[PDB]
Design a protein that fits this description.
PDB class: oxidoreductase
Distance between the termini of chain A: 52 Å
Strand content of chain A: 15-25%
Bound molecules: NADP nicotinamide-adenine-dinucleotide phosphate, the ligand Nc1nc2c(c(=O)[nH]1)N1C(=O)N(c3ccc(C(=O)N[C@@H](CCC(=O)O)C(=O)O)cc3)C[C@H]1CN2
Oligomer: homodimer
Subunit structure (chain A): Homodimer.
Order of helices and strands of chain A: EHEHEHEHHHEHEHEEEEHEH
Largest sheet of chain A: 6 strands, parallel
Protein name (chain A): C-1-tetrahydrofolate synthase, cytoplasmic
Subcellular location (chain A): Cytoplasm
Number of helices of chain A: 10
Largest interface: A-B, 32 and 32 residues
Family (chain A): In the N-terminal section; belongs to the tetrahydrofolate dehydrogenase/cyclohydrolase family. In the C-terminal section; belongs to the formate--tetrahydrofolate ligase family.
CATH topology of the domain at 4-136 and 269-286 in chain A: Rossmann fold
């Protein structure tokens, strides 16, 4: 009766080992060349501090040079833009991202900041240029946001093809839900996107051969709602009376065929995909 | 109940009259100000010439200043790009579009040309930057491609709110299907997108309280498939020969209209439905661009 456990910790480790071998070979082929990632943080949130360290540690194990720039809570939009512009022009820097959410005492427009990022270095894939390419089916030449990229990879580890399947995405955020739809749609699923104004959410979820939940409501998607045999991808990271997903795992694992645990599921794959995007940016720059 | 007929010909006429009144008032409020559209053509295709005249005539009736720049077939990519760049920088020009397809004797990359358009003037809404803004929820100020804009307007003329309805889009094209999803999603429908690899397309369509079909397969979506009470938006323009018609051809939609009209509550006929909304929507987008510039 248990669903097969998609082990994001093992799978991300396989990916990071592969990338390390890729990165080793670029240094042997072009000695002294170093792929380089930069992460720009605003404020000092404890969760952002933790997530940034995980990105930095994965990078340094692969042989990527990872720079961390922490700006204080007093920072303004103009200052943030000056750094974006400097990283744009610093040719030693192949990929960079702005960690979200921004922790400033001033108003800052997240979209204007992200959209100043040079699209060739937009490893998080959150620029409108990259979003627009993904949303319209032009996957040849954009970055894809790291969380949905990781989710797509996890779905593929099942061996079950996506084409013609009815997939359901619960959530439509810029970072996960909306690009998750687009990735599923352009891999030929029939995709239903749900959100907070969706009526009869249970009956929608029950149609999902593929289910990707990204809502930030702890365990809200019950196991009864899960289609028997579904692939369940749980993007949730919620702290409770302990970390739980957006899916009620214990009840969902009896119904699903493949499921992502929390932690050890989507989380470590998000970082592996960031590193993959960083190495692609470094490879394209060598031309 | 036979379905209420959404008359695109009347509704587009109401919109064009209203925009004219809007445009008159902006000139009286801010004297000297002239909303301005530019259309850039390459070559001399007969269909493009016809479509451009219709756009220009609608614009001049509204009081929009409409510039037509027709470049010869000998034109190169570099020349086309130089014009795009000049219209980008010409501050008197609020909206512009490149009419497609381009008719040149030289190779020209249509995607690179379109994507050089400044996103703030992209009234046809096809740039990647504008598509991305629409796709991720920035409907306050992005441009919307004219066909799905027209579809959204027609849905609203019913008075039936969109929020929490299950909507179905059959088709995912850059021109119609994909931007149609985004409009529906950001008006709080739960949206299911279908395409050529969708299995059991009939049973998907049957879940649609709102249905927007844009496939180019004549009458493929049968009336049986339609959910009782649905709003049916038919984007199809498919020609079938017919000697009983003045010009020897009939137009049918992507929906089997006669069988679908018994099941739906509101439906768009073909012709006279989505089609005549097209140009009015370009003009509406042009005035939005002019209004934002006035600030
Ligand atoms: N593992 C990773 O790498 C990773 C990355 C990013 C985020 N996350 C985690 O994933 C979760 C969500 O992330 P996010 O960035 O996508 O969040 P977000 O921006 O807060 O958006 C959450 C989405 O869930 C929808 N939602 C909320 N309540 C709902 C309900 N009752 N029924 C249906 N849908 C509902 C919202 O709809 P509306 O748009 O209508 O508000 C929204 O689209 C959080 O736990 C977050 O920590 C994980
Ligand atoms: N009145 C106007 O001004 C106006 C403007 C633009 C378009 N239109 C009309 O709208 C229609 C569609 O145009 P378009 O530009 O979207 O066409 P398109 O670019 O050819 O795309 C057609 C879409 O329909 C899908 N499709 C095709 N056969 C299907 C099937 N058997 N089952 C399900 N989906 C199927 C295709 O699937 P795949 O994604 O799998 O290829 C694709 O997504 C045409 O009749 C066109 O003339 C009207
Ligand atoms: N622009 C931007 N902002 C952002 C992200 C982003 O991509 N781009 N995000 C991440 O990196 N996040 C994340 C989440 C989890 C982890 C992570 O490694 N835990 C694992 C631990 C895995 C294990 O080793 O067992 C987990 O949740 O299970 C590592 C980064 C969250 C989100 C927050 N904000």
């Amino acid at each position: 009766a248990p669903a097969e456990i998609l082990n994001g910790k093992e799978i991300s480790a396989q990916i990071r080992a592969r990338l390390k071998n890729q990165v080793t070979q670029l240094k042997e082929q072009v000695p002294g060349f170093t792929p380089r990632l930069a992460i720009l943080q605003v404020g000092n949130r404890d969760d952002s501090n933790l997530y940034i360290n995980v990105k930095l540690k994965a990078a340094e194990e692969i042989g990527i040079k990872a720079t961390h720039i922490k700006l204080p809570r007093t920072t303004t939009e103009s200052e943030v833009m000056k750094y974006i512009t400097s990283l744009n022009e610093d040719s030693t820097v192949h990929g960079f991202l702005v960690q979200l959410p921004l922790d400033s005492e001033n108003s800052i427009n997240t979209e204007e900041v992200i959209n100043a990022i040079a699209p060739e270095k937009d490893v998080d894939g959150l620029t409108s240029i990259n979003a627009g390419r993904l949303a319209r089916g032009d996957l040849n030449d954009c970055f894809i946001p790291c969380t949905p990229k990781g989710c797509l990879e996890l779905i593929k580890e099942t061996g079950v093809p996506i084409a013609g399947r009815h997939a359901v995405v619960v959530g439509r955020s810029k970072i996960v839900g909306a690009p998750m739809h687009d990735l599923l749609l352009w891999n030929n699923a029939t995709v239903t996107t749900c959100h907070s104004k969706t009526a009869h959410l249970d009956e929608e979820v029950n149609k999902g051969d593929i289910l990707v939940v990204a809502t930030g409501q702890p365990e809200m998607v019950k196991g009864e709602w899960i289609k028997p045999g579904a692939i369940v991808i749980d993007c949730g990271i919620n702290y409770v009376p302990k970390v739980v997903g957006d899916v009620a795992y214990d009840e969902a694992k009896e119904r699903a065929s493949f499921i992502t645990p929390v932690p050890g599921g989507v989380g470590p794959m998000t970082v592996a995909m960031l590193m993959q995007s960083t190495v692609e940016s470094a490879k394209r720059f060598l031309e």
